[PDB]
């Protein structure tokens, strides 16, 4: 069973059409584009929902919603969720996949993933880490938890990070991440968030051999304090 939102999502407020690689505001929500090569775009709304298209990409990233100045962890700034509707449309070649929550923390600098779905044909699988915690109930469902170390460009600069990964074991396409019930679920596993810089929803297709097309719609994506 089902929130409203999943029934009634439908995109409005100003927008704003992106072509090149960019971090910007629309309305009072914060958007990314991203793409290492292929003739992309996204489409940034105010209400937080987003449109996106790529075409020939290695890797393309689409995500809109908070963005923090560093100061305070995730329990100083308070609880947080993130509802959304994901709409696959067409694709081709898509190798790899995540949608969900993304972020990132700094002191430590770390980057998080809370996947729930993927455009590819698969989940992403246990490649995405060097450490396999397992399985666990996290947010009314059961999600694989893994822990990776990464060497390459970031929000500091080319550097190296920790990530830390939750990968939904049943795709869903509409329905509220409980993102810090994740991050209480990692501090058990001893993966430490530092202060937040960022939590968005996130669209990010990619083939590692290049090549990969289509489209996604986000009718509804709003991260927000509360609960």
Same mark, same amino acid.
């Given at each position: 069973?089902?929130? #409203?939102?999943? #029934?009634?999502? @439908?995109?409005?407020?100003?927008?704003?059409?992106?072509?090149?690689?960019?971090?910007?505001?629309?309305?009072?929500?914060?958007?990314?584009? *991203?793409?290492? @090569?292929?003739?992309?775009?996204?489409?940034?709304?105010?209400?937080? #929902?987003?449109?996106?298209?790529?075409?020939?990409?290695?890797?393309?990233?689409?995500? @809109?919603?908070? @963005?923090?100045?560093?100061?305070?962890?995730?329990?100083?700034?308070?609880?947080?969720?993130?509802?959304?509707?994901?709409?696959?449309?067409?694709?081709?070649?898509?190798?790899?996949?995540?949608?969900?929550?993304?972020?990132?923390?700094?002191?430590?600098?770390?980057?998080?993933?809370?996947?729930?779905?993927?455009?590819?044909?698969?989940?992403?699988?246990? *490649?995405?880490?060097?450490?396999?915690?397992?399985?666990?109930?996290?947010?009314?469902?059961?999600?694989?938890?893994?822990?990776?170390?990464?060497?390459?460009?970031?929000?500091?600069?080319?550097?190296?990070?920790?990530?830390?990964?939750?990968?939904?074991?049943?795709?869903?396409?509409?329905?509220?991440?409980?993102?810090?019930?994740?991050?209480?679920? *990692?501090?058990?596993?001893?993966?430490?968030?530092?202060?937040?810089?960022?939590?968005?929803?996130?669209?990010?297709?990619?083939?590692?051999?290049?090549?990969?097309?289509?489209?996604?719609?986000?009718?509804?994506?709003?991260?927000?304090?509360?609960?």
């Amino acid at each position: 069973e089902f929130q #409203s939102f999943c #029934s009634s999502a @439908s995109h409005s407020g100003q927008s704003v059409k992106v072509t090149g690689n960019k971090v910007g505001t629309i309305g009072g929500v914060g958007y990314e584009l *991203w793409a290492d @090569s292929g003739n992309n775009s996204a489409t940034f709304y105010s209400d937080g #929902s987003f449109s996106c298209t790529f075409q020939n990409a290695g890797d393309y990233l689409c995500r @809109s919603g908070l @963005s923090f100045d560093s100061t305070k962890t995730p329990s100083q700034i308070g609880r947080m969720k993130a509802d959304f509707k994901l709409v696959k449309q067409n694709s081709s070649n898509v190798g790899y996949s995540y949608v969900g929550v993304y972020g990132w923390t700094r002191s430590p600098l770390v980057a998080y993933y809370i996947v729930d779905n993927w455009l590819s044909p698969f989940p992403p699988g246990d *490649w995405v880490g060097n450490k396999k915690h397992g399985s666990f109930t996290i947010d009314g469902a059961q999600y694989t938890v893994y822990e990776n170390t990464r060497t390459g460009p970031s929000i500091d600069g080319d550097t190296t990070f920790n990530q830390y990964f939750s990968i939904r074991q049943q795709a869903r396409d509409c329905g509220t991440i409980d993102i810090s019930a994740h991050f209480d679920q *990692w501090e058990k596993l001893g993966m430490t968030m530092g202060k937040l810089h960022e939590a968005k929803v996130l669209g990010e297709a990619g083939n590692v051999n290049g090549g990969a097309s289509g489209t996604a719609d986000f009718p509804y994506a709003k991260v927000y304090i509360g609960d």
